[PDB]
Amino acid sequence: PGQQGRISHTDLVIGCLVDLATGLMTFTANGKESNTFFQVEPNTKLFP
Amino acid sequence: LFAGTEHRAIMVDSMLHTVYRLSRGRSLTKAQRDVIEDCLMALCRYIRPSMLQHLLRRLVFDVPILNEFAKMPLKLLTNHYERCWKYYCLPTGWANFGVTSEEELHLTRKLFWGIFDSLAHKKYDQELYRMAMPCLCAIAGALPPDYVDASYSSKAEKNFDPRPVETLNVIIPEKLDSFINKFAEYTHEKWAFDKIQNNWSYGENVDEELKTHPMLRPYKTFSEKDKEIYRWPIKESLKAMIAWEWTIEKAREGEYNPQPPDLSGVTLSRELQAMAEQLAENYHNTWGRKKKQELEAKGGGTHPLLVPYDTLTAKEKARDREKAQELLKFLQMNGYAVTRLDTSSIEKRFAFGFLQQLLRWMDISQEFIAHLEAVVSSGRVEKSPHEQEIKFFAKILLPLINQYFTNHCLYFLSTPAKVLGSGGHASNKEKEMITSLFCKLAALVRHRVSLFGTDAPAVVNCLHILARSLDARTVMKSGPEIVKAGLRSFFESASEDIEKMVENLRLGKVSKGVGQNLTYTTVALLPVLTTLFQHIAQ
Protein backbone atom coordinates (compact mmCIF):
# COMPACT_ATOMS: atom_id res chain seq x y z
CA PRO A 1 0.00 0.00 0.00
CA GLY A 2 1.82 3.01 -1.39
CA GLN A 3 -0.87 4.98 -3.20
CA GLN A 4 1.07 7.99 -1.95
CA GLY A 5 3.87 8.25 -4.48
CA ARG A 6 2.11 5.48 -6.37
CA ILE A 7 4.76 5.55 -9.09
CA SER A 8 7.55 3.21 -8.01
CA HIS A 9 11.18 3.33 -9.13
CA THR A 10 11.33 -0.42 -8.46
CA ASP A 11 10.41 -3.24 -10.85
CA LEU A 12 7.86 -5.93 -9.97
CA VAL A 13 8.91 -9.53 -10.72
CA ILE A 14 5.92 -11.89 -10.59
CA GLY A 15 6.87 -15.57 -10.72
CA CYS A 16 4.60 -18.38 -11.93
CA LEU A 17 5.19 -22.01 -10.93
CA VAL A 18 3.41 -25.16 -12.14
CA ASP A 19 3.76 -28.79 -11.06
CA LEU A 20 2.91 -30.80 -14.17
CA ALA A 21 2.22 -33.94 -12.09
CA THR A 22 -0.18 -32.57 -9.44
CA GLY A 23 -1.89 -29.92 -11.55
CA LEU A 24 -0.91 -27.22 -9.04
CA MET A 25 -0.22 -23.60 -9.99
CA THR A 26 1.29 -21.06 -7.61
CA PHE A 27 2.64 -17.51 -7.73
CA THR A 28 5.36 -15.38 -6.14
CA ALA A 29 5.42 -11.60 -5.82
CA ASN A 30 9.10 -10.71 -5.25
CA GLY A 31 10.21 -14.06 -3.86
CA LYS A 32 7.25 -13.96 -1.45
CA GLU A 33 4.62 -16.66 -1.94
CA SER A 34 1.20 -15.39 -2.96
CA ASN A 35 -1.96 -16.88 -1.50
CA THR A 36 -3.54 -17.48 -4.91
CA PHE A 37 -3.31 -21.07 -6.10
CA PHE A 38 -5.01 -23.06 -8.85
CA GLN A 39 -5.77 -26.74 -9.42
CA VAL A 40 -6.17 -28.01 -12.99
CA GLU A 41 -6.95 -31.41 -14.45
CA PRO A 42 -4.39 -33.61 -16.23
CA ASN A 43 -3.63 -33.24 -19.96
CA THR A 44 -4.40 -29.52 -19.67
CA LYS A 45 -2.47 -27.16 -21.94
CA LEU A 46 -1.49 -23.73 -20.62
CA PHE A 47 0.22 -20.81 -22.34
CA PRO A 48 2.16 -18.17 -20.39
CA LEU B 1 10.57 19.34 -44.80
CA PHE B 2 9.02 20.97 -41.70
CA ALA B 3 5.77 19.05 -42.22
CA GLY B 4 6.43 16.18 -39.82
CA THR B 5 8.37 18.00 -37.07
CA GLU B 6 5.98 17.06 -34.27
CA HIS B 7 8.96 15.84 -32.23
CA ARG B 8 10.89 19.13 -32.40
CA ALA B 9 7.90 21.38 -31.70
CA ILE B 10 9.93 23.44 -29.25
CA MET B 11 12.52 24.35 -31.88
CA VAL B 12 9.89 24.95 -34.56
CA ASP B 13 7.92 27.29 -32.29
CA SER B 14 11.09 29.12 -31.26
CA MET B 15 12.03 29.62 -34.92
CA LEU B 16 8.53 30.85 -35.78
CA HIS B 17 8.66 33.34 -32.90
CA THR B 18 12.14 34.51 -33.92
CA VAL B 19 11.07 35.11 -37.51
CA TYR B 20 7.91 36.98 -36.46
CA ARG B 21 9.84 39.15 -33.99
CA LEU B 22 12.40 39.93 -36.70
CA SER B 23 9.53 40.85 -39.02
CA ARG B 24 8.53 43.36 -36.34
CA GLY B 25 11.95 44.97 -36.58
CA ARG B 26 13.17 48.54 -36.82
CA SER B 27 16.12 49.49 -39.04
CA LEU B 28 14.75 46.82 -41.37
CA THR B 29 14.39 47.49 -45.08
CA LYS B 30 11.34 46.61 -47.17
CA ALA B 31 13.14 43.83 -49.05
CA GLN B 32 14.37 42.26 -45.81
CA ARG B 33 10.88 42.50 -44.32
CA ASP B 34 9.36 40.88 -47.41
CA VAL B 35 11.89 38.04 -47.21
CA ILE B 36 11.03 37.45 -43.55
CA GLU B 37 7.31 37.53 -44.32
CA ASP B 38 7.68 35.02 -47.15
CA CYS B 39 9.68 32.68 -44.91
CA LEU B 40 7.04 32.86 -42.17
CA MET B 41 4.24 32.20 -44.65
CA ALA B 42 6.00 29.24 -46.24
CA LEU B 43 6.76 27.69 -42.86
CA CYS B 44 3.16 28.16 -41.72
CA ARG B 45 1.85 26.41 -44.84
CA TYR B 46 3.73 23.16 -44.30
CA ILE B 47 3.64 23.22 -40.50
CA ARG B 48 0.78 21.36 -38.85
CA PRO B 49 -2.08 23.46 -37.40
CA SER B 50 -1.52 22.15 -33.87
CA MET B 51 2.02 23.49 -34.07
CA LEU B 52 1.06 27.12 -34.71
CA GLN B 53 -1.06 27.48 -31.55
CA HIS B 54 1.52 29.65 -29.77
CA LEU B 55 2.01 31.91 -32.79
CA LEU B 56 -1.77 32.29 -33.03
CA ARG B 57 -1.80 33.28 -29.36
CA ARG B 58 0.80 35.99 -29.98
CA LEU B 59 -1.06 37.25 -33.05
CA VAL B 60 -4.24 37.45 -30.98
CA PHE B 61 -2.48 40.18 -28.99
CA ASP B 62 -0.74 41.80 -31.99
CA VAL B 63 -3.21 42.04 -34.89
CA PRO B 64 -6.18 43.74 -33.15
CA ILE B 65 -4.13 46.94 -32.85
CA LEU B 66 -4.59 47.20 -36.65
CA ASN B 67 -1.31 49.05 -37.13
CA GLU B 68 1.02 48.82 -40.13
CA PHE B 69 2.41 45.54 -38.78
CA ALA B 70 -1.07 44.00 -38.93
CA LYS B 71 -1.02 43.51 -42.71
CA MET B 72 1.14 40.40 -43.09
CA PRO B 73 -0.28 38.56 -40.03
CA LEU B 74 -3.78 39.05 -41.45
CA LYS B 75 -2.79 37.36 -44.72
CA LEU B 76 -1.02 34.62 -42.76
CA LEU B 77 -4.18 33.92 -40.76
CA THR B 78 -6.35 34.13 -43.87
CA ASN B 79 -4.36 31.45 -45.68
CA HIS B 80 -3.91 29.30 -42.58
CA TYR B 81 -7.62 29.19 -41.80
CA GLU B 82 -8.59 28.78 -45.46
CA ARG B 83 -6.47 25.64 -45.74
CA CYS B 84 -7.09 24.31 -42.20
CA TRP B 85 -10.79 25.15 -41.83
CA LYS B 86 -11.59 21.43 -41.58
CA TYR B 87 -9.24 21.20 -38.58
CA TYR B 88 -11.32 23.72 -36.64
CA CYS B 89 -14.84 23.46 -38.05
CA LEU B 90 -15.47 19.76 -38.59
CA PRO B 91 -15.79 17.59 -35.44
CA THR B 92 -13.85 14.72 -36.99
CA GLY B 93 -11.30 17.29 -38.17
CA TRP B 94 -8.81 17.26 -41.01
CA ALA B 95 -7.40 13.92 -42.11
CA ASN B 96 -4.08 13.08 -40.46
CA PHE B 97 -4.07 16.42 -38.62
CA GLY B 98 -6.63 15.74 -35.89
CA VAL B 99 -9.05 18.30 -34.49
CA THR B 100 -8.85 21.59 -32.62
CA SER B 101 -8.19 21.55 -28.89
CA GLU B 102 -10.77 24.17 -27.77
CA GLU B 103 -8.21 26.72 -26.58
CA GLU B 104 -7.37 27.21 -30.26
CA LEU B 105 -11.06 27.91 -30.92
CA HIS B 106 -11.11 30.36 -28.00
CA LEU B 107 -8.15 32.19 -29.53
CA THR B 108 -9.86 32.17 -32.93
CA ARG B 109 -13.01 33.72 -31.44
CA LYS B 110 -10.98 36.37 -29.64
CA LEU B 111 -9.08 37.25 -32.81
CA PHE B 112 -12.31 37.47 -34.80
CA TRP B 113 -14.00 39.79 -32.34
CA GLY B 114 -10.94 41.93 -31.68
CA ILE B 115 -10.45 42.56 -35.39
CA PHE B 116 -14.17 43.19 -35.83
CA ASP B 117 -14.39 45.77 -33.03
CA SER B 118 -11.11 47.46 -33.95
CA LEU B 119 -12.11 47.81 -37.60
CA ALA B 120 -15.55 49.11 -36.63
CA HIS B 121 -14.00 51.84 -34.48
CA LYS B 122 -11.19 52.72 -36.89
CA LYS B 123 -11.65 55.10 -39.81
CA TYR B 124 -11.81 53.83 -43.38
CA ASP B 125 -8.43 52.79 -44.79
CA GLN B 126 -8.80 51.18 -48.21
CA GLU B 127 -5.59 49.20 -47.62
CA LEU B 128 -6.70 47.77 -44.27
CA TYR B 129 -10.24 47.08 -45.46
CA ARG B 130 -8.79 45.30 -48.48
CA MET B 131 -6.46 43.23 -46.31
CA ALA B 132 -9.56 42.24 -44.33
CA MET B 133 -11.40 41.77 -47.63
CA PRO B 134 -9.97 38.27 -47.35
CA CYS B 135 -11.63 39.31 -44.13
CA LEU B 136 -12.65 37.52 -40.96
CA CYS B 137 -14.32 35.12 -43.38
CA ALA B 138 -11.72 32.36 -43.11
CA ILE B 139 -11.78 32.71 -39.32
CA ALA B 140 -15.57 32.42 -39.24
CA GLY B 141 -15.65 29.48 -41.64
CA ALA B 142 -13.09 27.66 -39.52
CA LEU B 143 -15.06 28.42 -36.35
CA PRO B 144 -18.11 26.18 -35.89
CA PRO B 145 -21.37 28.15 -35.58
CA ASP B 146 -22.19 26.05 -32.51
CA TYR B 147 -18.88 26.65 -30.72
CA VAL B 148 -19.57 27.56 -27.08
CA ASP B 149 -16.63 28.99 -25.15
CA ALA B 150 -16.09 27.62 -21.65
CA SER B 151 -15.33 31.14 -20.41
CA TYR B 152 -17.68 33.99 -21.38
CA SER B 153 -16.70 37.33 -19.87
CA SER B 154 -15.31 40.79 -20.62
CA LYS B 155 -11.55 41.10 -21.18
CA ALA B 156 -11.30 44.64 -19.69
CA GLU B 157 -7.68 44.58 -20.95
CA LYS B 158 -5.61 46.97 -23.04
CA ASN B 159 3.40 47.94 -23.97
CA PHE B 160 1.51 45.23 -22.06
CA ASP B 161 1.10 45.98 -18.35
CA PRO B 162 -0.58 43.51 -15.97
CA ARG B 163 -1.88 45.74 -13.16
CA PRO B 164 -3.88 44.55 -10.13
CA VAL B 165 -5.58 46.83 -7.60
CA GLU B 166 -4.09 46.89 -4.11
CA THR B 167 -5.17 48.55 -0.87
CA LEU B 168 -1.77 48.18 0.86
CA ASN B 169 -1.50 51.97 1.17
CA VAL B 170 -4.63 51.85 3.34
CA ILE B 171 -4.69 50.07 6.70
CA ILE B 172 -5.50 46.35 6.61
CA PRO B 173 -8.27 44.95 8.85
CA GLU B 174 -7.13 43.04 11.92
CA LYS B 175 -9.85 40.48 11.24
CA LEU B 176 -8.26 40.16 7.81
CA ASP B 177 -4.83 39.71 9.38
CA SER B 178 -6.37 36.91 11.45
CA PHE B 179 -7.71 35.41 8.23
CA ILE B 180 -4.24 35.61 6.62
CA ASN B 181 -2.75 33.87 9.65
CA LYS B 182 -5.35 31.10 9.54
CA PHE B 183 -4.79 30.70 5.77
CA ALA B 184 -1.01 30.55 6.21
CA GLU B 185 -1.31 27.96 8.98
CA TYR B 186 -3.67 25.86 6.83
CA THR B 187 -1.25 26.32 3.93
CA HIS B 188 1.49 24.86 6.13
CA GLU B 189 -1.06 22.10 6.85
CA LYS B 190 -1.41 21.36 3.13
CA TRP B 191 2.39 21.63 3.07
CA ALA B 192 2.78 18.77 5.55
CA PHE B 193 0.08 16.98 3.55
CA ASP B 194 2.25 17.50 0.46
CA LYS B 195 5.25 16.04 2.28
CA ILE B 196 3.07 13.07 3.27
CA GLN B 197 2.25 12.54 -0.44
CA ASN B 198 5.87 13.04 -1.60
CA ASN B 199 6.84 10.58 1.17
CA TRP B 200 9.93 12.52 2.30
CA SER B 201 10.18 13.60 5.92
CA TYR B 202 11.33 16.97 7.20
CA GLY B 203 15.12 16.96 7.32
CA GLU B 204 16.90 18.93 10.02
CA ASN B 205 20.17 17.96 8.34
CA VAL B 206 21.16 19.45 4.99
CA ASP B 207 21.25 16.99 2.08
CA GLU B 208 21.75 17.92 -1.56
CA GLU B 209 19.02 15.94 -3.34
CA LEU B 210 16.36 16.86 -0.79
CA LYS B 211 18.17 20.21 -0.60
CA THR B 212 16.34 20.64 2.72
CA HIS B 213 17.95 23.64 4.33
CA PRO B 214 18.32 22.86 8.07
CA MET B 215 15.68 25.53 8.64
CA LEU B 216 13.21 22.67 8.27
CA ARG B 217 11.76 22.79 11.77
CA PRO B 218 8.17 22.26 12.94
CA TYR B 219 6.11 25.41 13.32
CA LYS B 220 7.15 25.38 17.00
CA THR B 221 10.53 26.88 16.00
CA PHE B 222 10.40 28.43 12.50
CA SER B 223 12.30 31.69 12.14
CA GLU B 224 10.10 34.70 11.48
CA LYS B 225 11.75 35.81 8.23
CA ASP B 226 10.58 32.73 6.31
CA LYS B 227 7.09 32.95 7.83
CA GLU B 228 6.50 36.60 6.93
CA ILE B 229 8.04 36.26 3.46
CA TYR B 230 5.60 33.41 2.83
CA ARG B 231 2.90 35.63 4.36
CA TRP B 232 3.48 38.81 2.36
CA PRO B 233 2.23 37.27 -0.91
CA ILE B 234 -0.80 36.06 1.08
CA LYS B 235 -1.40 39.60 2.36
CA GLU B 236 -1.10 41.00 -1.16
CA SER B 237 -3.46 38.37 -2.57
CA LEU B 238 -6.21 38.84 0.04
CA LYS B 239 -5.91 42.63 -0.11
CA ALA B 240 -6.26 42.54 -3.91
CA MET B 241 -9.17 40.09 -3.68
CA ILE B 242 -11.09 42.50 -1.44
CA ALA B 243 -9.92 45.50 -3.46
CA TRP B 244 -11.60 44.06 -6.55
CA GLU B 245 -15.03 45.02 -5.06
CA TRP B 246 -15.59 41.46 -3.79
CA THR B 247 -17.39 41.54 -0.46
CA ILE B 248 -16.12 39.12 2.19
CA GLU B 249 -18.61 38.39 4.98
CA LYS B 250 -17.96 35.81 7.71
CA ALA B 251 -21.43 34.34 8.20
CA ARG B 252 -21.19 33.83 12.00
CA GLU B 253 -19.01 35.22 14.77
CA GLY B 254 -16.43 32.84 16.24
CA GLU B 255 -15.28 32.12 19.81
CA TYR B 256 -4.87 16.82 12.42
CA ASN B 257 -5.00 16.66 8.58
CA PRO B 258 -6.37 19.74 6.78
CA GLN B 259 -10.05 19.46 7.61
CA PRO B 260 -11.13 20.65 4.11
CA PRO B 261 -9.42 18.27 1.66
CA ASP B 262 -9.40 19.90 -1.75
CA LEU B 263 -11.84 17.63 -3.57
CA SER B 264 -12.11 18.05 -7.33
CA GLY B 265 -15.16 15.79 -7.14
CA VAL B 266 -17.19 18.71 -5.81
CA THR B 267 -18.91 20.34 -8.75
CA LEU B 268 -18.69 24.14 -8.56
CA SER B 269 -21.40 26.48 -9.75
CA ARG B 270 -20.65 28.25 -13.02
CA GLU B 271 -20.65 31.68 -11.31
CA LEU B 272 -18.22 30.36 -8.70
CA GLN B 273 -15.89 28.94 -11.30
CA ALA B 274 -15.93 32.26 -13.15
CA MET B 275 -14.81 34.04 -9.98
CA ALA B 276 -12.22 31.30 -9.46
CA GLU B 277 -10.65 31.79 -12.90
CA GLN B 278 -10.86 35.57 -12.42
CA LEU B 279 -9.06 35.38 -9.06
CA ALA B 280 -6.54 33.07 -10.71
CA GLU B 281 -6.18 35.76 -13.38
CA ASN B 282 -5.60 38.19 -10.50
CA TYR B 283 -2.92 35.88 -9.10
CA HIS B 284 -1.40 35.82 -12.58
CA ASN B 285 -1.68 39.61 -12.76
CA THR B 286 0.31 39.79 -9.52
CA TRP B 287 2.71 37.27 -11.06
CA GLY B 288 3.15 39.48 -14.11
CA ARG B 289 3.24 42.50 -11.82
CA LYS B 290 6.32 41.30 -9.95
CA LYS B 291 7.84 39.96 -13.17
CA LYS B 292 7.33 43.41 -14.72
CA GLN B 293 8.72 45.23 -11.69
CA GLU B 294 11.78 43.05 -12.26
CA LEU B 295 11.88 43.43 -16.06
CA GLU B 296 11.53 47.22 -16.19
CA ALA B 297 14.97 47.18 -14.58
CA LYS B 298 16.17 44.90 -17.40
CA GLY B 299 14.20 46.68 -20.13
CA GLY B 300 14.31 43.73 -22.52
CA GLY B 301 13.69 40.04 -22.92
CA THR B 302 10.02 40.16 -21.98
CA HIS B 303 9.25 36.79 -20.40
CA PRO B 304 7.40 34.98 -23.21
CA LEU B 305 4.60 33.51 -21.11
CA LEU B 306 3.47 36.95 -19.93
CA VAL B 307 0.13 36.90 -21.76
CA PRO B 308 -3.60 36.86 -20.92
CA TYR B 309 -4.51 34.23 -18.34
CA ASP B 310 -7.30 32.97 -20.61
CA THR B 311 -5.10 32.84 -23.72
CA LEU B 312 -2.20 31.01 -22.10
CA THR B 313 -2.05 27.23 -21.74
CA ALA B 314 -4.41 25.40 -19.40
CA LYS B 315 -1.64 23.50 -17.60
CA GLU B 316 0.04 26.74 -16.53
CA LYS B 317 -3.47 28.07 -15.89
CA ALA B 318 -4.06 24.93 -13.81
CA ARG B 319 -1.95 25.85 -10.77
CA ASP B 320 -3.45 29.32 -10.39
CA ARG B 321 -7.05 28.18 -10.89
CA GLU B 322 -6.45 25.32 -8.44
CA LYS B 323 -5.22 27.80 -5.83
CA ALA B 324 -8.18 30.11 -6.49
CA GLN B 325 -10.75 27.31 -6.24
CA GLU B 326 -9.09 26.05 -3.05
CA LEU B 327 -9.19 29.48 -1.43
CA LEU B 328 -12.80 29.99 -2.44
CA LYS B 329 -13.87 26.56 -1.15
CA PHE B 330 -12.14 27.32 2.15
CA LEU B 331 -14.06 30.60 2.36
CA GLN B 332 -17.45 28.96 1.76
CA MET B 333 -16.80 26.03 4.11
CA ASN B 334 -15.75 28.38 6.91
CA GLY B 335 -18.64 30.72 6.11
CA TYR B 336 -16.44 33.60 4.90
CA ALA B 337 -18.76 34.07 1.95
CA VAL B 338 -17.04 36.04 -0.82
CA THR B 339 -19.62 37.48 -3.21
CA ARG B 340 -19.64 39.84 -6.17
CA LEU B 341 -23.75 36.60 -16.97
CA ASP B 342 -24.26 33.01 -18.34
CA THR B 343 -26.45 33.43 -21.18
CA SER B 344 -27.35 29.83 -21.97
CA SER B 345 -25.37 27.74 -24.46
CA ILE B 346 -27.46 29.08 -27.35
CA GLU B 347 -26.57 32.66 -26.47
CA LYS B 348 -22.96 31.59 -25.88
CA ARG B 349 -22.74 30.24 -29.43
CA PHE B 350 -20.67 32.18 -31.95
CA ALA B 351 -23.39 32.52 -34.59
CA PHE B 352 -25.68 34.00 -31.94
CA GLY B 353 -23.37 36.92 -31.17
CA PHE B 354 -22.45 37.35 -34.82
CA LEU B 355 -26.11 37.70 -35.80
CA GLN B 356 -26.75 39.97 -32.80
CA GLN B 357 -24.05 42.36 -33.99
CA LEU B 358 -25.34 42.14 -37.56
CA LEU B 359 -28.85 43.09 -36.42
CA ARG B 360 -27.46 45.97 -34.36
CA TRP B 361 -25.61 47.20 -37.44
CA MET B 362 -28.84 46.88 -39.45
CA ASP B 363 -30.47 49.20 -36.92
CA ILE B 364 -27.56 51.60 -37.37
CA SER B 365 -28.07 51.28 -41.14
CA GLN B 366 -31.71 52.25 -40.78
CA GLU B 367 -30.60 55.27 -38.78
CA PHE B 368 -27.94 56.72 -41.05
CA ILE B 369 -29.79 55.95 -44.27
CA ALA B 370 -32.76 57.85 -42.84
CA HIS B 371 -30.39 60.70 -42.03
CA LEU B 372 -29.11 60.40 -45.60
CA GLU B 373 -32.59 60.85 -47.07
CA ALA B 374 -33.12 63.81 -44.75
CA VAL B 375 -29.87 65.49 -45.82
CA VAL B 376 -30.20 64.74 -49.55
CA SER B 377 -33.77 66.06 -49.52
CA SER B 378 -32.61 69.40 -48.10
CA GLY B 379 -29.45 71.00 -46.76
CA ARG B 380 -27.00 68.67 -48.47
CA VAL B 381 -23.77 68.12 -46.52
CA GLU B 382 -20.70 66.46 -48.01
CA LYS B 383 -19.38 65.54 -44.56
CA SER B 384 -21.46 62.37 -44.16
CA PRO B 385 -20.58 61.78 -40.47
CA HIS B 386 -21.60 58.12 -40.69
CA GLU B 387 -19.11 57.67 -43.55
CA GLN B 388 -17.17 55.19 -41.42
CA GLU B 389 -20.35 53.24 -40.68
CA ILE B 390 -21.38 53.17 -44.34
CA LYS B 391 -17.94 51.96 -45.42
CA PHE B 392 -17.72 49.32 -42.70
CA PHE B 393 -21.21 48.02 -43.46
CA ALA B 394 -20.85 47.81 -47.23
CA LYS B 395 -17.21 46.73 -47.46
CA ILE B 396 -16.92 44.25 -44.55
CA LEU B 397 -20.33 43.07 -43.38
CA LEU B 398 -21.92 42.27 -46.74
CA PRO B 399 -19.10 40.02 -48.07
CA LEU B 400 -18.77 38.50 -44.60
CA ILE B 401 -22.52 37.83 -44.47
CA ASN B 402 -22.38 36.31 -47.95
CA GLN B 403 -19.48 33.99 -47.16
CA TYR B 404 -20.73 32.98 -43.71
CA PHE B 405 -24.24 32.08 -44.83
CA THR B 406 -22.94 30.44 -48.00
CA ASN B 407 -20.67 28.20 -45.92
CA HIS B 408 -22.91 27.53 -42.89
CA CYS B 409 -26.24 27.42 -44.73
CA LEU B 410 -26.96 23.85 -43.64
CA TYR B 411 -26.52 24.61 -39.93
CA PHE B 412 -29.48 26.98 -40.19
CA LEU B 413 -31.70 24.76 -42.34
CA SER B 414 -30.88 21.59 -40.42
CA THR B 415 -33.35 20.23 -37.88
CA PRO B 416 -32.99 17.52 -35.22
CA ALA B 417 -35.39 15.34 -37.20
CA LYS B 418 -33.62 16.04 -40.51
CA VAL B 419 -29.94 17.01 -40.65
CA LEU B 420 -28.28 18.24 -43.85
CA GLY B 421 -25.03 19.28 -42.21
CA SER B 422 -22.28 16.95 -41.08
CA GLY B 423 -22.81 18.17 -37.53
CA GLY B 424 -25.12 20.55 -35.72
CA HIS B 425 -28.38 22.39 -36.37
CA ALA B 426 -29.29 25.99 -35.63
CA SER B 427 -31.48 26.95 -32.71
CA ASN B 428 -34.96 28.29 -33.39
CA LYS B 429 -33.80 31.65 -32.03
CA GLU B 430 -30.89 31.81 -34.49
CA LYS B 431 -33.34 30.98 -37.28
CA GLU B 432 -35.54 33.85 -36.09
CA MET B 433 -32.52 36.15 -36.11
CA ILE B 434 -31.53 35.24 -39.67
CA THR B 435 -35.13 35.74 -40.82
CA SER B 436 -35.30 39.13 -39.12
CA LEU B 437 -31.98 40.16 -40.67
CA PHE B 438 -33.23 39.19 -44.13
CA CYS B 439 -36.45 41.16 -43.71
CA LYS B 440 -34.57 44.16 -42.30
CA LEU B 441 -32.12 44.20 -45.20
CA ALA B 442 -34.97 43.97 -47.71
CA ALA B 443 -36.75 46.88 -46.02
CA LEU B 444 -33.51 48.86 -45.86
CA VAL B 445 -32.84 48.45 -49.59
CA ARG B 446 -36.51 48.98 -50.44
CA HIS B 447 -36.67 51.90 -52.86
CA ARG B 448 -33.07 52.93 -52.01
CA VAL B 449 -31.04 50.93 -54.57
CA SER B 450 -29.56 54.15 -55.97
CA LEU B 451 -28.69 55.42 -52.51
CA PHE B 452 -26.74 52.27 -51.91
CA GLY B 453 -25.17 52.60 -55.35
CA THR B 454 -22.47 50.07 -56.19
CA ASP B 455 -23.14 48.13 -52.98
CA ALA B 456 -26.63 47.20 -54.23
CA PRO B 457 -25.43 44.03 -56.05
CA ALA B 458 -23.77 42.95 -52.81
CA VAL B 459 -27.02 43.60 -50.94
CA VAL B 460 -29.00 41.54 -53.45
CA ASN B 461 -26.53 38.65 -53.31
CA CYS B 462 -26.59 38.68 -49.51
CA LEU B 463 -30.39 38.59 -49.70
CA HIS B 464 -30.24 35.60 -52.06
CA ILE B 465 -27.98 33.73 -49.64
CA LEU B 466 -30.10 34.64 -46.62
CA ALA B 467 -33.24 33.48 -48.42
CA ARG B 468 -31.61 30.14 -49.18
CA SER B 469 -30.61 29.95 -45.51
CA LEU B 470 -34.01 30.70 -43.96
CA ASP B 471 -36.12 28.00 -42.29
CA ALA B 472 -39.51 29.63 -42.79
CA ARG B 473 -41.40 26.51 -41.70
CA THR B 474 -39.87 26.52 -38.21
CA VAL B 475 -39.89 30.31 -37.90
CA MET B 476 -43.58 30.57 -38.81
CA LYS B 477 -44.85 27.68 -36.70
CA SER B 478 -42.82 28.55 -33.58
CA GLY B 479 -41.56 32.11 -33.81
CA PRO B 480 -42.28 35.55 -32.37
CA GLU B 481 -45.06 37.56 -33.95
CA ILE B 482 -42.42 40.20 -34.69
CA VAL B 483 -40.43 37.91 -37.00
CA LYS B 484 -43.57 36.49 -38.57
CA ALA B 485 -44.97 39.99 -39.14
CA GLY B 486 -41.68 41.12 -40.67
CA LEU B 487 -41.76 38.30 -43.20
CA ARG B 488 -45.44 38.93 -43.97
CA SER B 489 -44.69 42.63 -44.44
CA PHE B 490 -41.91 41.70 -46.84
CA PHE B 491 -44.42 39.72 -48.88
CA GLU B 492 -47.04 42.50 -48.79
CA SER B 493 -44.50 45.13 -49.84
CA ALA B 494 -43.27 42.94 -52.69
CA SER B 495 -46.87 42.56 -53.84
CA GLU B 496 -47.63 46.29 -53.63
CA ASP B 497 -44.48 47.17 -55.58
CA ILE B 498 -45.47 44.63 -58.22
CA GLU B 499 -48.98 46.06 -58.57
CA LYS B 500 -47.59 49.58 -58.92
CA MET B 501 -45.03 48.51 -61.53
CA VAL B 502 -47.65 46.55 -63.45
CA GLU B 503 -50.09 49.48 -63.57
CA ASN B 504 -47.29 51.83 -64.65
CA LEU B 505 -46.63 49.48 -67.57
CA ARG B 506 -50.41 49.64 -68.16
CA LEU B 507 -49.38 53.18 -68.89
CA GLY B 508 -51.79 54.74 -66.47
CA LYS B 509 -48.54 56.55 -65.71
CA VAL B 510 -46.26 58.09 -68.33
CA SER B 511 -43.79 55.12 -68.30
CA LYS B 512 -39.14 59.65 -60.61
CA GLY B 513 -40.93 57.42 -58.13
CA VAL B 514 -42.26 55.01 -60.76
CA GLY B 515 -38.87 54.67 -62.42
CA GLN B 516 -37.17 54.22 -59.07
CA ASN B 517 -39.66 51.49 -58.10
CA LEU B 518 -39.15 49.87 -61.50
CA THR B 519 -35.38 49.69 -61.07
CA TYR B 520 -35.80 48.48 -57.48
CA THR B 521 -38.08 45.67 -58.64
CA THR B 522 -36.05 44.57 -61.65
CA VAL B 523 -32.72 44.67 -59.81
CA ALA B 524 -33.49 43.41 -56.29
CA LEU B 525 -37.05 42.24 -55.77
CA LEU B 526 -37.95 39.75 -58.49
CA PRO B 527 -34.57 37.96 -58.15
CA VAL B 528 -34.73 37.69 -54.35
CA LEU B 529 -38.41 36.73 -54.31
CA THR B 530 -37.87 34.17 -57.08
CA THR B 531 -34.97 32.71 -55.09
CA LEU B 532 -37.11 32.52 -51.95
CA PHE B 533 -39.94 30.80 -53.83
CA GLN B 534 -37.48 28.30 -55.32
CA HIS B 535 -35.97 27.58 -51.90
CA ILE B 536 -39.42 27.15 -50.34
CA ALA B 537 -40.52 24.76 -53.09
CA GLN B 538 -37.27 22.79 -52.85
Swiss-Prot record, chain A:
Tissue: Detected in skeletal muscle (at protein level). Fast- or slow-twitch skeletal muscle.
Subunit structure: Homotetramer. Can also form heterotetramers with RYR2. Identified in a complex composed of RYR1, PDE4D, PKA, FKBP1A and protein phosphatase 1 (PP1). Repeated very high-level exercise decreases interaction with PDE4D and protein phosphatase 1 (PP1). Interacts with CALM; CALM with bound calcium inhibits the RYR1 channel activity. Interacts with S100A1. Interacts with FKBP1A; this stabilizes the closed conformation of the channel. Interacts with CACNA1S; interaction with CACNA1S is important for activation of the RYR1 channel. Interacts with CACNB1.
Family: Belongs to the ryanodine receptor (TC 1.A.3.1) family. RYR1 subfamily.
Name assigned to this protein: Ryanodine receptor 1
Species of provenance: Oryctolagus cuniculus
Lineage: Eukaryota, Metazoa, Chordata, Craniata, Vertebrata
Disulfide bridge partners, by residue number: none
Domain of life, source organism: Eukaryota
Signal peptide interval: none
Gene name per UniProt: RYR1
Record's miscellaneous remark: Binding of [3H]ryanodine indicates that the heterozygous channel is activated by Ca(2+) concentrations 4-fold lower than normal. Single-cell analysis of cotransfected cells shows a significantly increased resting cytoplasmic Ca(2+) level and a significantly reduced luminal Ca(2+) level.
Domain comment in the entry: The calcium release channel activity resides in the C-terminal region while the remaining part of the protein constitutes the 'foot' structure spanning the junctional gap between the sarcoplasmic reticulum (SR) and the T-tubule. Pore opening is mediated via the cytoplasmic calcium-binding domains that mediate a small rotation of the channel-forming transmembrane regions that then leads to channel opening.
